[PDB]
Amino acid sequence: RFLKVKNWETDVVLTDTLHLKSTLETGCTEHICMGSIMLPVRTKDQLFPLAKEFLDQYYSSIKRFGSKAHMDRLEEVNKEIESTSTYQLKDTELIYGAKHAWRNASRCVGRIQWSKLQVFDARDCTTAHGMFNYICNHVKYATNKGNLRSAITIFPQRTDGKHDFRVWNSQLIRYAGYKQPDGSTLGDPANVQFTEICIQQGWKAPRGRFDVLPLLLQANGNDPELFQIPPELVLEVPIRHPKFDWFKDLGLKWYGLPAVSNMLLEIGGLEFSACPFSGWYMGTEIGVRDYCDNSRYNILEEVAKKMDLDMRKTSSLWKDQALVEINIAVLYSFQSDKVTIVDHHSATESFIKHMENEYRCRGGCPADWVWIVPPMSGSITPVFHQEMLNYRLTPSFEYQPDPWNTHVWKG
Amino acid sequence: RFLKVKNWETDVVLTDTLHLKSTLETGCTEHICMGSIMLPTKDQLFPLAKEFLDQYYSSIKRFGSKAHMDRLEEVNKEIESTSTYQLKDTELIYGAKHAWRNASRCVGRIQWSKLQVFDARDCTTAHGMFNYICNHVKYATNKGNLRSAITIFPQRTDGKHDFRVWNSQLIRYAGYKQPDGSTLGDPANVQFTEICIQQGWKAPRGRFDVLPLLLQANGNDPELFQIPPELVLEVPIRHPKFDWFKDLGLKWYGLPAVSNMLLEIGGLEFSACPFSGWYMGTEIGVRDYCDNSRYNILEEVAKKMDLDMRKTSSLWKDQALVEINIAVLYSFQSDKVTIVDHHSATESFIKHMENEYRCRGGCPADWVWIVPPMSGSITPVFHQEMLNYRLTPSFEYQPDPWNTHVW
Ligand code: HEM
Ligand code: HEM
Ligand SMILES: Cc1ccnc(CCc2cccc([C@@H](N)Cc3cc(C)cc(N)n3)c2)c1
Ligand SMILES: Cc1ccnc(CCc2cccc([C@@H](N)Cc3cc(C)cc(N)n3)c2)c1
Ligand SMILES: C[C@H](O)[C@H](O)[C@H]1CNc2nc(N)[nH]c(=O)c2N1
Ligand SMILES: C[C@H](O)[C@H](O)[C@H]1CNc2nc(N)[nH]c(=O)c2N1
Ligand SMILES: [Zn+2]
C-alpha cells in the first residue's frame, strides 16, 4: 500500500512505501491523534528477530543481502545470543546503526547531514573517569575551533539494566539554574533540578547567570561522579546585535556546541543508554526557545523595554518584534565569530530537499511536523506547507527516564 | 482510556474523557501518524439520529424523559417512512453551535455558544439564497462590530438536489492569470475566477476585485450575483509608523465567511451552510499577504524598508512579516472593525480548553492548526498538548461542486 503527501505551496506530491517497513508504534489510533503529545530487561525471546532484522537492513545497504558473510553473521549472532544472552555489534554495524538512528529521527530538521557523522566507539569504557576522558575528546573534536562537526560517542550497551552507563546531564554543555528563596531563578530555569543534584553531589556553584554545569557521569551502574569540562574546551559566543549597540549590555552569551546526552540509542535490539551526540545550532533554538520561552531566560520584556516598543497592548506585536531582533542578534554573533550555525529558512529549505531525495532513493522520510516547523515564522518556511508522515523506524533515538529517578544508590 | 494532556509551560495537566464519545475517524493508525495531512440509508441514518438526540436531550437535562423518548419514536417513524427527517429549530441551533464547538482546528471557539443561526431551510432558489446571504452579511458585519452567524440551507436529499455556494468564502478577491505568466489579484481563487468569467461576470481585472456570488439551488445550474458593495466592509491597510506603507495598495475585507463546508447534524447533511466570525490578524498578514502562493508581498515590503535581502540570515522576511502584521491589526482597530491578534486569541483558547476540560471532560484540538503561523512558541498554545479527535455534529470538507454538478 502506497501513501501520498502533497506540498501545498508547490503542488509536489510524493509517495511513501517506507512506512511499510515500520515496526514500533505511534501513540495514535483510528480514533485519536497523539501527534502533539510530547513524550509518547529484554530476553533472548524477542532479541534475535530484532537482531536479524537489523542485520538484514545492514547487509542490504552494503549490497550483500544473502551473502555467505550475511548468513554467517546471522548464525554467529544467533549462537552468541543463546550462549551469552546478548551480542556485540561489529564496528561497521555500530557506525551504520548510529547514522540510521539519526536518519530515522523524524523530529530532526537537520537530517540532510545524517551520513556525515563521526562515531566514537567508547564500548571499552569502564569508569566515569574513562567517560569524562571520552567526552572531552568528543567536545574538542566536534567543536573544532568553531567549525562544528557532527559526532556521537557510544558507551557500553545495557546488560541486565543494573549496570547502565549514563550521562546524567541532559546536554554535555548546559547552564546552571538556581531557584532563589524569593521565587525568582538565576541562570537557566530548565536546569534547576539537575543543578541541585550537582550541588548535592559536591559541586561548588559559582551561582552566576551562565555557569557551565559539571559533567555528572555514571559507569557500569555505579553512583555517578562530578567532572568540570576544561573551560578552554567550552566555546561560548557573546551575543550582540549588528545595529543595536545596547544589546551587548544585556550580558547574554551562549555555548556553541549543542550535544544531547540523555537519549537512548536502539540498534538491533541493543540499548545504548549513554550515547551523547552533537551537531550545530539552528538559530531559533537559542533565540526563540532558550531566550524567549516564558520558562527559560525570558528576555523578551527586557529587550522590548530597551527598544522602547509600545508594550501596553499585545496587538502592537511588541513580542514578535523583540523576538526577531534577538534572533538576528544570535545569528550575527555566531557568524561573526565563525561558529557554525544555520538560520531557520536555510535549514528548512535544506530539509525539504533532503526529504524529497529520501523519497526518491529510500521510499520515504518519517517526519514530525509539530517539531520540524520552526517556533517562529512557521509559514514563511517551506516545511509548514509540507505534509509529512510520521512513523517509527529502527535504528532509533528514544527518550529514557531521568537517571536520578531510577538509580539504585550504592552509597 | 482516560487521557492526560500537559502544558509544558505551566505544568497544568488536564484529563480527557470526552474522546471516548468519539464517533468519526482520524486518518492515523498505531503505525503511522497523519496529524499533518490537510484532508483525510434508513439503516445508517437512524443510529446517527439517536446519538444526536441522546446528546441533545442530555444537554437540556431531559435524558430519559418522555419528551426525549417520543421525539425518538417520532423521528424513527419519519425515517421509516420518508427516508430522512427534519430537525426542530432547537436541535438545529444546538446542532450548529456544536459543529463549531467540535471544530478541532478552530482557535476561536471560546465564542462557540454565541452563534446566531439563520434557518433558511425554506429557501427554494438562487435568488432566495442571495437574499439570505446578504442578510447574513449585513447582520454579521454590523457596521464593523462583527457578530458570529451561520445560515443553513435545505439538507441533502438524493444528492441530486444539492444547495451549494460555489464560492469558498462569501467575500474573496478575484485571481487572474496573465500574459506575463504571473498572477493578478489572489492566486487562491484563479480557477473560481475563470468559472465566473466563463459564466458571464465582467471582471474589472484589478488586484482586489470582490468576486461575485455563484449560487446553486436544488441541483440547478448556479447563478451570478454581485453583493451590494455597501455590504462589503473593507479596510485599507496602513502602518502606525511607516508613511509609505499605504502606497503598497493593500486592502482586506472585514468579514471572514467560509461557504464551501458541509454541516452534519444527526446524520443530516447541510451542503450549503456559510458561516462567519472575525479575523485573527495572522490569517491576512501572514497567510494571505506572505504565502509564496498568495499575495506574496514580502519581497516588496522588505525593499521599502531597505533591509539587507542578500542573505536569508538577516531575517528580513521575518522582520517584514512582523511589520506587515502590525499594519493589519492597526488598520482594523483604527477603522473600528473587529479583529483579534494571535497572542490574545491563543490565550483565550487556553482559557476555553480549561473550561471544556472542566465542563465537558475535554476539547478536541488540532495542534498543527491551532498554533499561529508566526511566533508559534511565544504563544501559549505552542506548549499545550492537544488531543485531536472527531465528534459530531461537525463541519466537513466537500468536493468542489464544479467537479460534481451535472449541467
Ligand atoms: C547538524 C546539526 C543539527 C541541527 C541544526 C539539528 C536540528 C534539530 C532541531 C531544531 C531539533 C528540534 C529540537 C528542539 O527544538 O528541541 C532537532 C531534534 C532532534 N535531532 Fe537534530 N539537528 C542537528 C544534528 C543532529 C545529530 C548529529 C543527531 C543525532 C545523531 C540529531 C538527532 C535529533 C533527535 C533524536 C531529535 C529530537 C529528539 C526527539 O524529541 O525525538 N540531530 N535537531
Ligand atoms: C469568532 C471569530 C473566529 C476566529 C478568530 C476563528 C479563528 C479560526 C482560525 C485562525 C482557523 C484556522 C483556519 C486557517 O488558518 O485558515 C479557523 C478554522 C476553522 N474554524 Fe474558526 N474562527 C472564528 C469563528 C468560527 C465560526 C463562527 C465557525 C463555525 C461556526 C468556525 C469554524 C472553523 C472550522 C470548521 C475551521 C477549519 C476547517 C477545517 O479545516 O477543518 N470558525 N478558525
Ligand atoms: C521531553 C523533552 C522536553 C523538552 N525538550 C526536549 C528535547 C531535547 C532535545 C533533543 C534533541 C535536540 C535538542 C536541541 N534543542 C539541541 C540540539 C542537538 C543537536 C545534536 C543538534 C541541534 N541543532 N540541536 C533538544 C525533550
Ligand atoms: C484546501 C484548503 C486549504 C486551506 N484552507 C481550507 C479551508 C478554508 C477555511 C476554513 C475555515 C476557516 C478559514 C479561515 N481562513 C477563514 C475564516 C473563517 C471564519 C469563520 C473565521 C475566521 N477567523 N477565518 C478557512 C482548505
Ligand atoms: C506540547 C507540544 O507538543 C510541545 O510544546 C512541542 C511542540 N513542538 C516542538 N517543536 C520543537 N522543535 N521543539 C519542541 O520542544 C517542541 N515542543
Ligand atoms: C501541510 C500542513 O498540514 C498545512 O500547511 C497546514 C498546516 N497548518 C495550518 N494551520 C492553519 N491554521 N491553517 C492552515 O491552512 C494550515 N495548513
Ligand atoms: Zn496522529
Coordinates of N, CA, C and O in Angstrom, one line a residue, chain A residues 6-12 379-383 385-386, chain B residues 290-294:
Chain A
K6 N 1.3 15.8 -0.1 CA 1.3 16.9 -1.0 C 2.0 18.1 -0.4 O 2.0 18.3 0.9
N7 N 2.8 18.8 -1.2 CA 3.2 20.1 -0.7 C 2.3 21.2 -1.3 O 2.1 21.3 -2.5
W8 N 1.7 22.0 -0.4 CA 0.6 22.9 -0.7 C 1.0 24.2 -1.3 O 0.2 25.0 -1.7
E9 N 2.3 24.4 -1.3 CA 2.9 25.6 -1.9 C 3.3 25.3 -3.4 O 3.0 26.1 -4.3
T10 N 3.8 24.1 -3.7 CA 4.5 23.7 -4.9 C 3.7 22.7 -5.7 O 4.0 22.4 -6.9
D11 N 2.6 22.2 -5.1 CA 1.9 21.0 -5.6 C 2.6 19.7 -5.8 O 2.1 18.7 -6.1
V12 N 3.9 19.7 -5.5 CA 4.7 18.4 -5.5 C 4.0 17.4 -4.6 O 3.7 17.6 -3.4
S379 N 5.0 29.8 8.7 CA 4.5 29.7 7.3 C 5.4 30.3 6.2 O 5.1 30.1 5.0
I380 N 6.3 31.1 6.6 CA 7.2 31.6 5.6 C 8.4 30.7 5.3 O 9.2 31.0 4.4
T381 N 8.5 29.6 6.0 CA 9.4 28.5 5.8 C 8.7 27.4 5.0 O 7.5 27.2 5.3
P382 N 9.4 26.7 4.1 CA 8.6 25.8 3.3 C 8.1 24.5 3.9 O 7.2 23.9 3.3
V383 N 8.6 24.1 5.1 CA 8.1 22.9 5.7 C 6.6 23.0 6.2 O 5.9 22.0 6.2
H385 N 4.2 24.0 4.8 CA 3.3 23.7 3.7 C 3.5 22.3 3.2 O 2.8 21.9 2.2
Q386 N 4.4 21.6 3.8 CA 4.7 20.2 3.5 C 4.0 19.3 4.4 O 4.3 19.2 5.6
Chain B
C290 N 1.6 36.9 2.7 CA 3.0 36.4 2.6 C 3.2 35.0 2.1 O 4.4 34.7 1.8
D291 N 2.2 34.2 2.1 CA 2.3 32.9 1.4 C 2.9 33.2 0.0 O 2.4 34.1 -0.7
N292 N 3.9 32.5 -0.3 CA 4.5 32.5 -1.7 C 3.4 32.4 -2.7 O 3.5 33.0 -3.8
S293 N 2.4 31.5 -2.4 CA 1.3 31.2 -3.4 C 0.1 32.1 -3.2 O -0.9 31.9 -3.9
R294 N 0.2 33.1 -2.3 CA -0.9 34.1 -2.2 C -0.4 35.5 -2.7 O 0.2 35.5 -3.8

